[PDB]
Design a protein around this ligand. Structure first.
Ligand SMILES: Nc1ncnc2c1ncn2[C@@H]1O[C@H](CSCC[C@H](N)C(=O)O)[C@@H](O)[C@H]1O
Ligand SMILES: Nc1ncnc2c1ncn2[C@@H]1O[C@H](CSCC[C@H](N)C(=O)O)[C@@H](O)[C@H]1O
Ligand SMILES: Nc1ncnc2c1ncn2[C@@H]1O[C@H](CSCC[C@H](N)C(=O)O)[C@@H](O)[C@H]1O
Ligand SMILES: Nc1ncnc2c1ncn2[C@@H]1O[C@H](CSCC[C@H](N)C(=O)O)[C@@H](O)[C@H]1O
Ligand SMILES: Nc1ncnc2c1ncn2[C@@H]1O[C@H](CSCC[C@H](N)C(=O)O)[C@@H](O)[C@H]1O
Ligand SMILES: Nc1ncnc2c1ncn2[C@@H]1O[C@H](CSCC[C@H](N)C(=O)O)[C@@H](O)[C@H]1O
Lengths: 125, 125, 123
């Protein structure tokens, strides 16, 4: 593998007071379910399924701007555009952006980051 | 040097139907111990030790393709090629690829992603 | 290729801080980062926010690694052009804080990587 592809990374808060969750495991399950829901909805329209690897985390920023002491509970979502599944990388990028905005809405987040990083994918099967 | 080098990232499932681990921390230890073993075996042959930073995760894809509701338990392994230890970036890359295939086999996975990403390493010691 | 992100891998020094779980180690590192980032922001108007993840780092038992890995924390953060006017000064700030983190966590060695990234920010 010498050609390049992309990976995305999204950082989202988990809004435990709105969703009535009380643990990292509950937040991961919630984000997993929401992502599965919206990713399937977009797959049905475009044949692009943005699968995601989601990790528990906390995000540390200024207490003045709303951060709890020691950090806000967050989830990181990351995923590669696998060339075996993705014909059109620009259409995949548009789909990730669409889903990131929808995740922001579903999670009731005020702001949200979505990054694209160049990567060289070796796929073992 | 400017520290221009590579990092790798692997995403592996944990085969609960095979290992019967009963928590996220047990899955982490299971993958960590396996990685520790195969990394040492390769180091004894090549003097390349691919150390790895491992994170708990859930991977979310279409339930039609076997994904449990809210995602499958996975582990993400990431590591840099530190020029302090690595003379030859291409041999390190070939070592990572060998270990990724070996991990896929030892974890009894049908597919496994292994990505290389360009990175600028600043090493403080 | 619009901007940069950093990633730092830190030990948690169980023998010094006496945390009992990965949740406590995460909070310990987070609180330390929150303080040094705030103090640097007052000086330079650059606030290096960080997304921190629990982890274990696996290396050779001959070099001190516990069986199945050492408990670690990964810190990662982007330079958001809406906040950051000077990417080189942000980079210098990240390095400054990473060294200060290494000191406060009583670590012997620490990695700090920079990766090119294209940031889309939704508000
Ligand atoms: N994220 C993903 N993970 C696993 N398999 C995927 C996938 N996205 C797509 N596939 C597989 O690819 C099939 C065809 S969808 C992709 C069609 C075409 N390559 C395109 O880019 O438009 C899916 O039904 C599924 O079998
Ligand atoms: N990718 C990233 N890198 C670094 N800091 C980030 C980040 N994404 C978010 N942050 C930090 O965390 C803050 C958001 S906290 C999570 C979002 C918030 N609950 C809301 O509703 O908007 C940002 O202001 C920034 O300081
Ligand atoms: N992943 C790793 N983490 C920490 N130390 C490592 C390491 N890999 C190698 N080392 C250190 O480097 C020593 C020499 S290994 C030979 C390295 C040589 N420059 C090459 O590229 O072939 C190891 O015994 C260990 O002390
Ligand atoms: N790096 C990555 N980025 C995005 N999705 C990924 C991914 N790695 C795996 N996936 C998703 O997760 C699915 C695999 S689940 C993990 C492997 C499985 N247990 C097996 O034994 O084959 C992939 O088909 C894809 O949909
Ligand atoms: N890490 C961060 N996360 C979120 N907002 C941030 C931030 N760093 C700075 N800001 C935002 O930037 C505002 C002004 S400080 C930045 C001043 C100027 N752009 C400079 O480069 O010096 C803060 O009040 C806050 O709203
Ligand atoms: N970014 C990275 N990628 C891969 N391995 C890493 C790494 N950062 C650290 N390691 C591994 O973990 C070891 C450090 S363990 C954590 C630091 C230690 N507590 C100290 O105070 O020095 C390194 O020798 C290397 O083998």
């Amino acid at each position: 593998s010498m050609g390049k592809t992309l990976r995305f990374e999204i950082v989202s808060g988990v809004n435990k007071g709105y969703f009535h969750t009380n643990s990292q495991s509950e937040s991961l399950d919630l984000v997993g379910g929401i992502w599965q829901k919206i990713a399937k909805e977009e797959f049905e329209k475009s044949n692009i399924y943005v699968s995601a690897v989601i990790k528990p985390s906390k995000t540390v920023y200024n207490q003045e701007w709303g951060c709890p002491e020691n950090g806000e509970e967050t989830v990181v979502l990351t995923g590669v555009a696998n060339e075996e599944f993705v014909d059109d990388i620009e259409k995949w990028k548009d789909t990730v952006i669409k889903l990131a905005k929808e995740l922001k809405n579903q999670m009731k987040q005020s702001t949200l980051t979505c990054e694209f990083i160049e990567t060289e994918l070796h796929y073992f099967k």
